[PDB]
Each structure stands twice: as structure tokens, then as C-alpha cells.
Ligand binder design. Structure first.
Ligand SMILES: *Cc1c(COP(=O)(O)O)cnc(C)c1O
Ligand SMILES: *Cc1c(COP(=O)(O)O)cnc(C)c1O
Lengths: 334, 333
């Protein structure tokens, strides 16, 4: 395995976790080598979108130990996505133990310290069993597979351009705050249209008025104001990201920064001297410019990442890998 | 027992199965395996990349079989597929696959006179190993069928529905495509309405919540006091084939004007009748709509209105062959 040339691509690892919900209960779960799921043709996950997923990383530390980053936060969010779709919830200790068992079973896929790589875990819950007619499924599967991943973009931290979309990933009172498959399906065509126009992704505005930024592709938006405040959107349809939460907490408690969670108007991009997108896969994607009504707004530079973004990226990656001592409760040693 | 038929999954004998790989659909096959074997990384399971259709085949009194407007399903699934970046099934391939499933499962076709039919569920799903939101490298097109009874929502008994504060779809989302995410968004709001003793939720336009868009997973129609057939038109409404059929029959057989336009929630008094239309039940009459904790009653809570009766008579009669069909609507199997 060439650790440096790793991207964010499916690779079949050795074992995955698999657990069935039947007759009101989760089974005890197992680790299996089979990466093919065998599910009814009538699965609600395949007909009525009854599906949700999570994403988290484990990192090799310089001292050789293994950091699994904030899996409790994934557990909490998946409990909320399950509830929104009427699926049984996986309790937090069950969830974290399953994740740890998957990491333990696939340690040979963990990229070594210093490669910038990580082991990505994909838990998901899906409605299965024979069914027709929209309702919650009679059975469910909770599974977790992992893949070795490298830098999402190669070359390191560099600015990327994004394009405002006229389409919506989520409704004003829809499922946008749950990490569920229907939000992504709504993003397929808009994302494709932004990329065909040679942008990194689409940016989604609030679905009621299209006056406020909500999401950058499948990542949260942040702007850095001229007076150095970390600003990020707040609305019922924004996905509450764990990277965003982590950056908010590090900004407040480690970097001496002010945070604003509020309305980010698309007619006021001049408020920000830097901007970026955050999420588990990309960590931080710096935004060079946003194209809106066919004009490119550049915050800082098309060629250089601004210093505040660099400092946030340094802090967050340092905590993830064990080079900077983490806040209480963030790291689970595997 | 055709008498107790509802809308429930039963494993029938054969289903159609076709894979898209390397830019081409295979030639299809009929299989007895009702278990799909798909990658743990399938976009159909992670990114909602899935769509489906629904149509019925009816045993006629003369022994023949009517498949109802499968071309219209073909057209809509093409649009649903395009909206989710899935490969399309051309109309002749789709219709032939539907006919093959009907012929392979004729013993599950309920006899004429029972109200039963054979319901077909085509669907297209993204499959193959993948991570990261994009269109899948492979797809499955499958069609299975089940016997269904038309009175499973009660027949022409009226029901009460409750306006929801939630949205099934965004203004510029996937609401006009028949994809699973729209249903996933409706699961909780529909459950809340049922727990409050309503038949289902009614969804308003998502931008303003002033106009009716959908009744559960069925389209809305109203009959005005001056005998116009009115149904919602918006970029987020699902364009139903039952609704399309009722519009054409209302115009050409019942001599009514059709309005496809806005159904404002504060103008419910414009309608002497209202109903919900869709493939499985055809029409469910709306006795009442609850909004702002007040129940608006259209015609009656216990009896269906006469215009709804004429519409139901005409459409179900066309479906079963008791009434001559408009040109091209019926495919004989
Ligand atoms: C998952 C996701 C994010 C980022 O969430 P993380 O928990 O940081 O990985 C942001 N926006 C959208 C729309 C997402 O789906
Ligand atoms: C499928 C569906 C309908 C009805 O469509 P038919 O083609 O008549 O079966 C109506 N509203 C919604 C939201 C639907 O999903």
C-alpha cells in the first residue's frame, strides 16, 4: 500500500462489523469478511430512503498508539438521524465499541504516522427485510466498514473555487440536519453541474429564500471576519458537523477566538477575509472564491491559504494525531 | 384469498433483473432470487441513489390482461433517473420487462370482479463499491410484482388528513422525481399524523406553506362548487399518472374544466369535494382536512361525493376493460 498516493476511495479491508435488528433488539454483532450485503428486494433502504450514515477517522500517533477521533459525537448524531427516519438507535457504548473492534481488526490498514493518512470508518443503519408501502422497515442492519484514506486533495492545503447553486440539498423543514441518503441524492445533479462548470462543488443557500449560505458541497461553511471572528451558518436545515463543532471548540478554548453562529448573507461575502469548508473527509478545504451571479468573489487569494485557516488546520490536525494534547473526552485510544 | 388482499409484500415467482455496467444495460433476465446482492458501498444505500415506479395489471372479464399506461411510468422513471444521474431505461425495454414479469406471474393475477390487480414495482438503484457522493459505477434495474386489492385504503370511504409543519421535499429538490428520499422525509410526519388519529399528513408548498402539494404519497384534487377539477401544479409536486388520467377523463368524458394551479389552504371552501389519487388505491376521498386545529369538511365525513364517484367509475372502468379506454392507454399482455 502506497500511503502517500491514497485518496478517498473505496478499498476492501479485511473485516467489517455487521449487526441485525429483529424482534425489538440488536443482536450482539459480528465481524465478517463479506463486503456484499444480502438484503430483500423490498428493503425500505432501497425504495423509501430509509438509511443513514456516519464518518470518522482513526490516526496512528507518533508514539505508536491509535487515536479514534470523537466517535461519541458520531454516535449522538446517528441516534438523531435514526430517530428522524423511525429507525432503532444504536446506543453510544455499543456504537463506540463496534467502531473500536473494526479498527482493531484492520490495524494493518492504518497509514503510519507522518504520512497524513488515516483509517476512515463508515457506520450506517439501513431498513431491510421484505416490505412494500411506505413505513418503517421490519428489520434493520447496522454495519461499519473501514478504508485507508490519505489527503482528500493532493498537494496539501490550497484554495479551491465553488459555485452557488440554484438547487436545494434539503427542504426548510426537511431532513437536512440528519445525515441521511436523501440529502445526498438531492446534491448529485447540482454537484455535477458545478463540477461540469469546473468548480470544486456547489454551495447551497437557505431553501426558503436563497439569501444565506448553508453548506459547501457536503461540508460546513466558515468565514473569518476582518476582526478575526469564526462565523458559521446556523439554521434548522444545516447539517451539524463534528469538524465544525471541533473547530468552534478549539477556536474558543485553544486559539483565543470569538465564534458567531448565525446568518451568513450571500450578498455580504466582503465580510470575510478568509473562508473555508470543514468536514471529516477534507478536514478543511480553503475557499479561494465563490462564483455567484457569474462573478467570482475572492476572499484572500486564489493561490495562498490565509493564516487563520492555516492555524485552525494546524490545531485540528495536531489534536487528531496526538501532536497537540486534545480537549477532554475527544480521543478514544484503540 | 382475493377477498382479503391488501398492499403487502408476497414473494411471487419471477422478477426481472438487469445490470448496467461499462455504459450498457445487459439484456435482462427473470430470476427467482428475491434477495439482492449489492456492495456494502452501494450509493443506493448511502446516498439515496434510487428510484421506483408503480403500475397495475388487471384481468379483464374477457380473459385478457390490461397493463395500465406503462409508457407513462417509463417516461417518469426516465426523468427520475436523469435527476439522480442514473442511466435511463428506454421506453420499449421498460415495457417489455413489465410484460415479461406479468406473463411469468399470471397465477398471481386476481380474477376479474374482485377489485384485485397485479401491482408491478420497477426500480433502479446505484450499486458497486464506492465511497464519496457521486453517481455509482454500476446500476440494477429490477421489477417484482405482488397481488394487490384496490380497497386496501377503504375504497370510497372518506378519511381525515392533517396539514404537516414538515416538508417532504425542497422547493428545488427531488420532489418531482419518484425517489426514496422524498418518502424518507415523509416517514416521521406521516407517523405523527397517524398517531394523532389521521389517515396521513398533507404537505404544503415548502417555500411558503400556503398551498397544498401532496396528500401523503398521493396527489390532491378538489372539485369546485362550479364543477372544475383543480389540482396542484408546482416544481415540487410529484406528477402522478393517476392524476394525469383523471385530468384527461374529466375533460373528455365528464365534460369538466381542469385547472392545474394553486390550491390555497385558506380557500378550502371553494371545493364541494376533495380526494387523494394514486396508483394503489386509485382515489381515497377526503372527508376533512385539519389545519390550525380546525377540521374543514368538504362533502361528508361518511359519504363520498358524486363527482368523485363518476371519476372513480370512469378510471377503474377503463383499467379493467369495462369501459373503452382512450387511445394508447392499455397494453394487452
Ligand atoms: C457530513 C456533512 C458535513 C460535515 O460533517 P462532519 O461531521 O464534520 O464530517 C457537513 N455538511 C454536510 C451537508 C454533510 O453531509
Ligand atoms: C407516486 C406519488 C403520487 C401518485 O403517483 P401515481 O403515478 O398516480 O401512482 C402522488 N404523490 C406522491 C408524493 C407520490 O410519490
Amino acid at each position: 500500500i502506497n500511503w502517500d498516493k491514497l485518496g478517498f476511495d473505496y478499498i476492501k479491508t479485511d473485516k467489517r462489523y455487521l449487526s441485525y435488528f429483529r424482534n425489538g433488539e440488536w443482536d450482539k454483532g459480528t465481524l465478517t469478511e463479506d463486503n456484499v450485503l444480502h438484503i430483500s428486494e423490498g428493503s425500505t433502504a432501497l425504495h423509501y430512503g430509509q438509511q443513514c450514515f456516519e464518518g470518522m477517522k482513526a490516526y496512528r500517533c507518533k508514539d505508536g498508539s491509535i487515536n479514534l477521533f470523537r466517535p461519541d459525537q458520531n454516535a449522538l448524531r446517528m441516534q438523531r438521524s435514526c430517530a428522524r427516519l423511525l429507525m432503532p438507535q444504536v446506543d453510544t457504548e455499543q456504537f463506540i465499541e463496534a467502531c473500536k473492534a473494526v479498527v482493531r481488526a484492520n490495524e494493518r490498514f492504518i497509514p503510519p504516522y507522518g504520512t497524513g493518512g488515516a483509517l476512515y470508518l463508515r457506520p450506517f443503519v439501513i431498513g431491510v427485510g421484505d416490505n412494500i408501502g411506505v413505513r418503517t422497515a421490519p428489520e434493520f442492519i447496522f454495519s461499519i466498514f473501514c478504508i485507508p484514506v490519505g489527503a482528500y486533495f493532493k498537494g496539501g492545503l490550497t484554495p479551491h473555487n465553488f459555485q452557488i447553486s440554484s438547487y436545494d440539498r434539503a427542504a426548510p423543514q426537511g431532513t437536512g440536519a440528519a445525515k441521511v441518503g436523501g440529502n445526498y441524492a438531492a446534491s448529485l445533479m447540482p454537484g455535477s453541474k458545478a463540477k461540469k462548470a469546473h468548480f470544486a462543488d456547489a454551495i447551497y443557500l437557505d431553501p426558503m429564500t436563497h439569501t444565506k449560505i448553508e453548506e459547501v458541497g457536503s461540508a460546513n461553511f466558515f468565514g473569518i471576519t476582518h476582526d478575526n471572528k469564526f462565523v458559521t451558518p446556523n439554521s434548522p436545515s444545516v447539517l451539524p458537523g463534528i469538524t465544525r463543532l471541533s473547530l468552534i471548540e478549539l477556536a474558543k478554548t485553544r486559539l483565543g477566538m470569538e465564534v458567531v453562529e448565525g446568518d451568513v448573507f450571500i450578498d455580504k461575502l466582503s465580510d470575510f477575509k478568509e473562508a473555508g469548508a470543514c468536514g471529516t473527509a477534507a478536514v478543511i478545504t480553503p475557499i479561494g472564491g465563490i462564483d455567484y451571479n457569474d462573478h467570482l468573489h475572492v476572499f484572500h487569494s486564489e493561490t495562498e491559504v490565509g493564516p487563520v485557516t492555516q492555524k485552525l488546520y494546524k490545531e485540528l490536525t495536531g489534536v487528531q494525531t496526538g501532536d497537540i494534547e486534545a480537549p477532554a473526552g475527544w480521543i478514544v485510544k484503540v
